[PDB]
Subunit: 312 residues, 4 copies
Amino acid sequence: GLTIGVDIGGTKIAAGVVDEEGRILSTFKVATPPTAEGIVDAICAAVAGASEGHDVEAVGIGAAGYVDDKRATVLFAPNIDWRHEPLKDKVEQRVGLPVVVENDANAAAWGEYRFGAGQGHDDVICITLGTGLGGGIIIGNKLRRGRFGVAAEFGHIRVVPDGLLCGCGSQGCWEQYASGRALVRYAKQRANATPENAAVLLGLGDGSVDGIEGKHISEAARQGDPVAVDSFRELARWAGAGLADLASLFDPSAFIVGGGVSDEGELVLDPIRKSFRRWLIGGEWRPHAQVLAAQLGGKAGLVGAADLARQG
Amino acid sequence: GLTIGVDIGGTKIAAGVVDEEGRILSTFKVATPPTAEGIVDAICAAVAGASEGHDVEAVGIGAAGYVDDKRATVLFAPNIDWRHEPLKDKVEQRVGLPVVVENDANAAAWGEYRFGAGQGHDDVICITLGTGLGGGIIIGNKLRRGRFGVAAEFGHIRVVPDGLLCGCGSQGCWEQYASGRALVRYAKQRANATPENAAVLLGLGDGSVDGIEGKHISEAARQGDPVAVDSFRELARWAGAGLADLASLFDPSAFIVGGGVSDEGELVLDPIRKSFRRWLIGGEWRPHAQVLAAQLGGKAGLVGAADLARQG
Amino acid sequence: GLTIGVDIGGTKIAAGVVDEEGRILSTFKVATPPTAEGIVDAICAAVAGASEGHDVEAVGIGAAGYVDDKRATVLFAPNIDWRHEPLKDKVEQRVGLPVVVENDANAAAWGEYRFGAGQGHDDVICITLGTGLGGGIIIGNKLRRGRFGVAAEFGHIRVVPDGLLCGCGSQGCWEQYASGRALVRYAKQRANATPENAAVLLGLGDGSVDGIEGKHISEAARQGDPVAVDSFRELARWAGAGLADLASLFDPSAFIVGGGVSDEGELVLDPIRKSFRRWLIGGEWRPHAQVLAAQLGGKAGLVGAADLARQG
Amino acid sequence: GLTIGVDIGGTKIAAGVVDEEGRILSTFKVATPPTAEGIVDAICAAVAGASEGHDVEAVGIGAAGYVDDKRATVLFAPNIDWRHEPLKDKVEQRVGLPVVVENDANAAAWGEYRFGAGQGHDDVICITLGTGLGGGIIIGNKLRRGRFGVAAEFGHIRVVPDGLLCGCGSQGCWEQYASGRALVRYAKQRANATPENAAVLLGLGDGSVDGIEGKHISEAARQGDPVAVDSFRELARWAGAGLADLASLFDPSAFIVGGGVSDEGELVLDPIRKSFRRWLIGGEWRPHAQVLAAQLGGKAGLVGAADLARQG
Ligand SMILES: OC[C@H]1O[C@@H](O)[C@H](O)[C@@H](O)[C@@H]1O
Ligand SMILES: OC[C@H]1O[C@@H](O)[C@H](O)[C@@H](O)[C@@H]1O
Ligand SMILES: OC[C@H]1O[C@@H](O)[C@H](O)[C@@H](O)[C@@H]1O
Ligand SMILES: OC[C@H]1O[C@@H](O)[C@H](O)[C@@H](O)[C@@H]1O
Ligand code: NA
Ligand code: NA
Ligand code: NA
Ligand code: NA
Ligand SMILES: [Zn+2]
Ligand SMILES: [Zn+2]
Ligand SMILES: [Zn+2]
Ligand SMILES: [Zn+2]
């Protein structure tokens, strides 16, 4: 039958009814509230909104945090105020439907494996670029959550010793260098330094550096705004180097890049792919994985979460 | 029946006859020669020496390099002169027994999973500390080699951007910071700076910095030589931080540390474990893997390689 | 005659009447307000308070920012809201006395050269550890401010490429790794990870991590609190490595460490000195500078600023 | 009258007779031999060759190492086998003329200050890019050697913690990232990865990566060889970032870039200057130094050394 998927990210909540073939039948979006209690309210509003007109059997939540092996509790989140949050229990008692809670990028990996760019592969690795950087692991045709449920937390691999402060409480985490937030940071740095090379970018906002938004950077880069193009170059430096490290770790047939910015397709995927190829160890002597945009784009997580609910 | 395992590392070749329960029935050791042709000669000598007195059915090779998915060819090695080396074919035609070629640390992981510290677990990660740093992945009770056979090359994950030159041709690789060679480097740095704190260490060699060998550092640290103890501290800084990154990646129930220096047990494992716990993301909010010495120590690879031959 | 020195730091304003031999005759302290206009008010209050009972001829300001070659304007400050601030003009029109504006750590260097640990030397380098990290250069018995007045901004030398965000707008600046603020950061990190090793430290505050203050860390370290001792070790790692770089740059006869934490003397100077000696290039082949506490401690800047006013 | 200058670098020895206006009247070049005794022989050959036809009064040596405050002894050299080498005494007894020994880049700074790009300035900083990276400091119209003679060893400032091994015995030194040797390294890395983008570069040598020489990279970049252009970009990343750090340290009116590659002028200076401006702290709020090629190019050191002999 039909289930609902709800993707709860640091910035946005998105929900939809999803059928057995991963077709999205409805859309609901709302901003992620700042408190755990407000988030439960918003989840309920999202489920109610997306469910309009449809007979719904279960709810799958893709949550932006460390989710336990029982798929019920958000143990820890760097960019949302969740600490040992019993999300399954709270949502079940309010919506009156069975709920499964999965990590958001685990869910995106699953969505792409079933219905997107991972179809036909056995071993694929997903990264999502958004508020943070999430990971998802498909090995031997199965999602791998690890012993304690918290595998694929790629965003907190240390890429710069003693580097940037992260929401997780550590320093130098990959997500501080490769994420939608990092992209925005790169563009604001560059627009502040050389505003004369950011005219198009600034014109898409309110004209100020502070008014630069992720989607502006994408549109401006399409139009050839040098500062926007350079910001994507910097994002790709770190995203591609990290994908090369993931090739050393997992050696998959494909990497699948999701998150909101993956909606931009080759605009972001081409520099990431080129960077991956520059960083891949062993030069000419070893094979290279494909580097692919999430076919479902930013919706992969809600689709995968919906489908993971259906297999409950 | 009985098979032979041969572990070919950057420094040493070790072979032995191994029974069905992973008992080692014979030992042969020789230094790794500098050329690929000399290595084939040494493999043949090792097989002949270890095989004395025993009826042997197959040969498993654990090779210190990137091994292909067909388990026959060393694609690339950073510390041995192998480039697309058809090791299976060359050894088969000379010994007249079936041969399987596996990566050495893949083989160590398998040996520990079957006969050592990984028994009873479903998801474990092995690192070996030796000439280089090797990895091995057991997920869902199975060795995972990846799409192209070259998963678990943990030694070439970039831990320091623009860092130390590595034999793989890249910079900043984990193995330049955590390996037996790195340990020796740390001790020589420290003994050169403060020889008065290295009296015991230098006394175990020829009295010179250049004469410091890995095994001297271990023995000296047991005796409380401050420079040797400090060198183990530095090795553990990098080994433990990397294990914390592997927890972010794989979230296994256990890490198993092998390689020659794992022969030292808690001398090296205790600082590595303590370091792992200091670096593990998420503080009190998430569970910690065990950090264990390879029960087979430096012999895990030959045992695992022997057993992988038997399942051919 | 007598002049007033006023040291305006990121956290504190301190003023005093200073005689010709650098004796401090009065003390006034107030917290640094958050706005430039509030700071001018506070400077006036500090001058009035310190001046009680004394015939005062001039005012010297040691300001925590980039000061111009005319010694009148704060061009830029990372931790105070000053941008092209005409501090000399604003204070002169309100106090009715001649004013000279110097960088705070330039003033501290001068105070120590004239009246403190730099006496008898010709070439000394000062660093101050406080809200930020400041520098001061004495070469050939003269304070060196550079062509544009902004020499000795040692706090913004990049020590970690792509490292921690700094108030100056760049990343990886020395002051993010060595300063009083960094010390507090190190202690809060360590007390959060292992509170059982921070009992004494937490007991000196309100019992919480958030309640840890710099002075608590110092007192706790004196009492042997392991977390406090470890925090000083981490501060010294970065402070000493940077002093070794300054030896490569300037090769002075002495380094003088000032700022509020220098009030602690050998508690902080001993680990910094030991670290300096570990990092100094060239081992046994080259001589080492002295590493000394500011004899005037945190008051060096106000003394030096007072004296720089007198030579106007 | 006339003196001889001799510049002894890691790769090359160059000598010439120099008049009072810094005009070079003769040229002699020979490769730097591998032993200290062979170097003294080569110095004597260089002095004899350059002196042909000329009445010579003194010899100034610009030596690529840490030179003492007495200007007589090479205390330490990272790229030449000198340890406490009494160069003045050895050369004086063999040539029978007075000798002064200065650091090579100190001598280059002096040559440029007197006869080149530093004319008219009071405070300038020189870096030389060659076998290593050297520095020279002019402050208040005077060369500054520091208390122990070893100021301006900019090549061994640590730019990457735990970075590349340096000849000085430390890691992460600036000279491993910015020097002629680093340039060659960058080009060989890039030509090995993408030889199809290095056709012109490889054609100027023997066609192999191993045959790439510094001068080939320069010529190829002029012709628009993408790999050569990219190598200069990478050199400039590190050289410019370091110059921005030197602006924080010294705030001079000008930086002067010397060494053999400075012979190329704007080919290398333009990317270095642009990089400097990108990295300079404080954006629009503070003034920028000039970044200039050594007017004497690679000959600055021999000219400056000759002139420093004349002021003995
Ligand atoms: O939302 C993307 C990712 O953000 C990271 O900060 C969280 O640790 C992950 O659990 C999540 O998958
Ligand atoms: O021998 C340990 C490891 O050394 C590394 O340098 C090689 O890349 C690996 O394949 C090997 O497992
Ligand atoms: O207050 C100490 C130092 O703090 C730094 O952040 C400022 O840039 C310096 O100008 C000041 O000397
Ligand atoms: O030759 C350039 C520079 O090379 C460096 O390696 C040496 O330490 C310096 O003394 C010298 O000036
Ligand atoms: Na995940
Ligand atoms: Na492996
Ligand atoms: Na200063
Ligand atoms: Na010099
Ligand atoms: Zn993190
Ligand atoms: Zn490597
Ligand atoms: Zn800064
Ligand atoms: Zn060095």
